[PDB]
Amino acid sequence: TSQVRQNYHQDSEAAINRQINLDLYASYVYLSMSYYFDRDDVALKNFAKYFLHQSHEEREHAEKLMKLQNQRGGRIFLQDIQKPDCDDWESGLNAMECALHLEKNVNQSLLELHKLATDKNDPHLCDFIETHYLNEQVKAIKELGDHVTNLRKMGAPESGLAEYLFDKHTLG
């Protein structure tokens, strides 16, 4: 037992390790999406930049969880980072829809982690998740929904003109 450990349940420690993996996975999904938009036969540079930014942000989410694990005297155990479900992301709209789905899955995991913190009476962990994770998820989900709505209303994915103009006027 770490000299620093206090009020930190083994189940919470294990859940934090699962969430570290999930955020690394999310970073990898967005990395794949980014470079899909960098292909010469897709060529939407601002979709590419947008998803690369999200990829680096997810990696920061994972590092802050790793820091948390050590702060509480837990021990980090890393697992393989699974490759994303898709190699080809089809369209800007489809990538946005996939990102929305991903963020809702990450949110569900964080809400389950918060419930575990509650159940184990770990207010420091509750506060950590609330302060640093839950509103980030709500903001991300709202932003992605807004993007999906605009792309659909503009006529994507069939209108390549729509995705081109959204790339310039929203993601620019």
Residue 11 or 86: which CB sits closer to a copy of itself? Answer: 86
Residue 23 interacts, among Zn ion, a copy of itself, none and using kind-specific CB cut-offs from 5 to 8 Å, with Zn ion
Q: How far is the CB of 62 from a copy of itself (least distance, A)?
A: 8
* Helix pair 92-119, 45-72: axis angle to 10 deg: 10
If DSSP codes are grouped into helix, strand and coil, which group holds residue 85? Answer: coil
Closest CA to 76 of 118, 19, 116: 19
Asked if 9 is part of the footprint of a copy of itself (rule: CB under 8 A), the reply reads no
Asked if 80 is part of the footprint of Zn ion (rule: CB under 5 A), the reply reads yes
Asked if 93 is part of the footprint of a copy of itself (rule: CB under 8 A), the reply reads no
Residue 54: both structure tokens together: 């999200």
Asked if 70 is part of the footprint of a copy of itself (rule: CB under 8 A), the reply reads yes
- Cβ-contact 126, 114 below 8 angstroms: yes
Residues 22 to 41 in contact with Zn ion, rule: CB under 5 A: 23
Residue 102: both structure tokens together: 């991903």
Asked if 76 is part of the footprint of Zn ion (rule: CB under 5 A), the reply reads no
